[PDB]
């Protein structure tokens, strides 16, 4: 804990320096942070080891940084590692040794795995273990006894208190082992899901499944892959391997439609077996082997409609061998997490790309779903050509003097509308759409603010998608954007910031945003992150523009929301001005037009 | 010969250590005042150690060849002022490239690490490599993170000028180039181009293969942070308005332009601003009528 003169953490009385440190690529500080050299010969092995034991903090091209935490080590033991194996390999890779604090810290976070198990059988939840001592210790705890239902020893628990049970079990250093032995479960009939031969999984998809299916049992946890990496196939492949009734929870009605398409594309399950449970329509969920729904539909708190209530009754009175939770980052929400207790699932597979939140509830995923089974590297997939090479750029749009006159004074929450509807920002967006459309590029324009979304869309005369747009109407827009040559650019809102699979979307322009949401920024960039048809790995296939207004709070938010992407190695170029704007017939080119816009913005309040 | 280069580097480094606020540095009143009168240091209080002037920080970030040359040039200029003929010392430098004043000059050169007698200040002297007139160690990331493979406190001190030091290891130091750190360095006197040049020259071999070796975003963002401070261009001047004589306003404008005093002008509003140095001259011209 010593601090240098330059506020730096001095760690030399803590650890010595090894002799052949040149070959060793790893620094292990007593703080738990680990720094890896990406240019070392043994980087590949070190990267695989570190991501299992430590969740990445930042992974630029040259030097990566990982942090050692209790949850990260608990994930390491789950996949198969042992304390001796972890400390032995870490010491071998470490070029300065493992400080005594870290050595004991690793040991502490590994003698707790497998002691206690949670088993779901015959619609009843039992906390089972082979060691009566730990079970008795759990019983001593008050809340553990409170949630009890009112050799190997198992005591039944009530479903509504699983989350409290799981949460406390973590606090007691006795995490519940939520592992499903699907291969030895004849109670639940096997489904006819099969992975068709045409599906050839990518190396990172296979690795992620191997971590989930390392042993015969299926591990419940979170698999993290870059947006557009192919998480759907991992979910489909997980369902194919388990071969039991699978429940898939998307983020929106568009996501479940894509999920249904993925199952048909990558699996031999017939369409009659696949069912959707959404407000728009349902394919008879009472009879269905693979059920696809949304958090909003299942997580609804108010009394449901009769048609939806009948489906909910069937879902509640069912045992699911695999619950795929798409966009896991939204689970820790107050009502979305309730969905886990509502549905009785054996294995809960979490799929996400941005395991971040602006609150501290992201860690709840450890006791809600499970440890992070895998986390792929964005740059490694980028270089390998599995995801598009995105040139992130931040376009600085100087704030109009008449608009800025109002912005500097007004502070009653009217700023967001004021600097979002910046005439300069509109002109930059209009020019970028004009420039890239001439390049046969497919543009997605994201606007969190609906007023700005409509304003740009009608003014530019482009289709736009947001809350009120019906599921059928927005699905038609996506289909036209995918296939119609005339439709080259679409406007989307907070609705489509996730789960929108647009393989050919080359360009993405962001004109409005919700605070400093790192998740929203990273998720939005994911729309144009799919591998392109004739893509080349090192040719910058896709482009990402984040239009911001200078001398405005959006500049502060812009840096905040770029934190996750830079941690992945993405560099955000700054574009103070765009060449060719002057010679382009852009709107708001006269003070009269700008004055009219400001009055409308002020009126909107 | 192999020891001469080490001697010169160590002797020059300790001078650099003294320049920065390093308690462990060579103590020498003559050197301390020599730096103070060199334009890159100022004490104002002999009892207390001197601080670093605005030009002092700029001098530190310079490369060793240019860094040494600037000091030598300042030494030559001060040689005449202190009473030492420039020609005598200049000839000695030329001889090195290929009396009491010479002895004093030689002693100062030894203090700088350029020369070393090695025989208790004998007549014969062995000039070092620097007397006639290095692999990089910093890895710059796209997230404003510097990983400098340094064992010396001087290089850490130089990097710490424009960055926040996070972790320290014997063969690596983790630093972050934040806006606050860069802005503080710019305020102290450093310029962005010096920081990019400082990082560029001390660039890890891993960064050399990629072009540009320094990622453009890091180099650009440093420049933008520098440009942020000078968003407003303050310039003292005297404003003239109420130009009733519109015809004569142009004549005054031409007169101001001829004298070179005009700084800014607005013909549409019939006004102009002139530096106070020439304010009297234009005032006299107007009074003449």
């Amino acid at each position: 804990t010593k601090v240098d003169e330059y506020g730096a953490k001095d760690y030399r009385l803590q650890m010595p320096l090894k002799d052949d440190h040149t070959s060793r690529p790893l620094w292990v500080a007593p703080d738990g942070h680990i720094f890896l050299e990406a240019f070392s010969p043994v980087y590949k092995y070190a990267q695989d080891f570190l991501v299992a034991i430590a969740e990445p903090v930042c992974r630029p091209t040259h030097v990566h940084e990982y942090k050692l935490t209790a949850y990260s080590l608990y994930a390491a033991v789950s996949v198969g590692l042992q304390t001796s194996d972890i400390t032995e390999y870490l010491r071998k890779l470490s070029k300065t040794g493992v400080p005594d604090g870290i050595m004991q810290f690793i040991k502490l976070c590994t003698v707790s795995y497998g002691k206690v198990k949670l088993v779901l059988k015959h619609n009843r939840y039992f906390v089972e273990s082979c060691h009566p001592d730990v079970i008795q210790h759990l019983l001593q705890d008050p809340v553990i006894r409170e949630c009890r239902l009112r050799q190997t020893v198992s005591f039944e628990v009530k479903q509504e208190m699983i989350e409290e049970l799981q949460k406390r079990c973590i606090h007691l250093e006795y995490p519940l082992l939520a592992e499903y032995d699907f291969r030895n479960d004849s109670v639940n009939p096997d489904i006819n899901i099969d992975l068709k031969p045409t599906a050839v999984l990518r190396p990172y998809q296979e690795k992620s499944l191997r971590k989930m299916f390392g042993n015969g049992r299926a591990r419940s946890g979170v698999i993290v892959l870059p947006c557009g990496a192919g998480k759907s196939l991992v979910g489909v492949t997980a369902a194919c391997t388990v071969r039991k009734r699978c429940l898939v929870l998307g983020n929106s009605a568009v996501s479940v439609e894509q999920w249904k398409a993925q199952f048909k594309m990558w699996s031999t399950i017939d369409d009659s077996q696949i069912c959707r449970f959404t407000s728009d329509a349902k394919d008879k969920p009472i009879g269905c082997s693979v059920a696809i729904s949304t958090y909003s539909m299942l997580g609804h708190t108010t009394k449901r409609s009769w048609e939806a209530e009948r489906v909910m009754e069937w879902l509640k009175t069912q045992e699911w061998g695999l619950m795929i939770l798409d966009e896991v980052h939204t689970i820790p929400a107050k009502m979305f997490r309730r969905v886990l207790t509502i549905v009785q699932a054996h294995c809960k597979l979490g799929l996400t790309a941005t395991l971040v939140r602006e609150d501290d509830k992201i860690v709840d995923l450890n006791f809600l779903i499970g440890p992070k089974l895998y986390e792929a590297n964005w740059m490694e997939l980028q270089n390998n050509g599995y995801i598009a090479k995105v040139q992130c750029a931040e376009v600085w749009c100087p704030m109009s003097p008449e608009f800025y006159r109002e912005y500097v004074a007004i502070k009653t929450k009217k700023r967001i509308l004021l600097y979002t509807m910046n005439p300069n920002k509109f002109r930059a967006c209009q020019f970028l759409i004009k420039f890239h459309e001439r390049r046969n590029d497919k543009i997605i324009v994201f606007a969190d603010n609906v007023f700005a979304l409509k304003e740009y869309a009608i003014r530019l005369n482009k289709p736009y998608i947001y809350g009120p747009t019906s599921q059928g109407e927005r699905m038609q827009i996506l289909q036209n954007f995918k296939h119609n040559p005339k439709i080259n650019t679409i406007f989307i809102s907070k609705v489509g910031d996730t789960s929108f699979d647009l393989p050919e979307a080359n360009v993405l322009i962001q004109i409005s945003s919700h605070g400093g949401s790192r998740r929203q920024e990273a998720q939005r960039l994911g729309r144009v992150l799919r591998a392109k048809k004739g893509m080349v790995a090192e040719e910058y296939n896709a482009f990402f523009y984040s239009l911001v207004s200078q001398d405005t709070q959006e500049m502060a938010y812009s840096t905040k929301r770029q934190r996750f992407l830079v941690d992945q190695g993405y560099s955000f170029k700054v574009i103070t001005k765009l060449a060719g704007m002057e010679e382009e017939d852009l709107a708001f080119s006269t003070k009269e037009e700008q004055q009219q816009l400001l009055q409308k913005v002020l009126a909107a309040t | 010969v192999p020891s001469l280069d080490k001697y010169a580097e160590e002797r020059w480094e300790v001078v650099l250590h003294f320049m920065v606020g390093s308690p462990s540095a060579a103590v020498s009143q003559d050197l301390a005042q020599l730096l103070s009168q060199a334009g890159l240091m100022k004490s104002t209080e002999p009892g207390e150690p001197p601080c670093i002037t605005s030009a002092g920080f700029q001098f530190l970030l310079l490369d060793t060849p240019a860094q040494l040359w600037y000091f030598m040039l300042q030494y030559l200029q001060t040689a005449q002022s202190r009473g030492m003929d420039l020609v005598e010392i200049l000839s000695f430098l030329f001889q090195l490239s290929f009396s009491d004043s010479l002895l004093n000059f030689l002693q100062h050169l030894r203090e700088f690490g350029l020369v070393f007698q090695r025989k208790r200040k004998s007549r014969r002297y062995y000039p070092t490599r620097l007397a006639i007139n290095q692999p990089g160690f910093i890895v710059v990331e796209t997230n404003y993170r510097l990983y400098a493979y340094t064992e010396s406190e001087l290089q850490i001190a130089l990097i710490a000028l424009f960055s926040e030091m996070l972790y320290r290891f014997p063969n690596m130091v983790v630093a972050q180039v934040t806006r606050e750190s860069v802005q503080q360095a710019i305020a102290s006197g450093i310029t962005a181009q010096q920081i990019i040049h400082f990082l560029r020259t001390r660039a890890h071999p891993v960064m050399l293969k990629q072009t540009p070796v320094l990622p453009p975003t890091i180099t650009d963002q440093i420049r933008l942070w520098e440009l942020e401070r000078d968003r407003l261009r303050f310039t003292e001047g005297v404003l003239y308005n109420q130009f009733l004589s519109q015809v004569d306003f142009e004549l005054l404008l031409a007169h101001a332009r001829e004298l070179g005093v005009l700084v800014f002008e607005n013909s549409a509003k019939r006004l102009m601003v002139v530096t106070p140095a020439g304010h009297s001259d234009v005032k006299r011209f107007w009074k003449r009528q």
Binding site: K573, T576, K577, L578 | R223, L227
Partner: peptide
């Protein structure tokens, strides 16, 4: 063959 735009290709910073 559809080269990148100037603003993306090279820095637009005055410095």
């Amino acid at each position: 063959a559809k080269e990148r735009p100037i603003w993306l290709r090279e820095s637009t910073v005055q410095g």
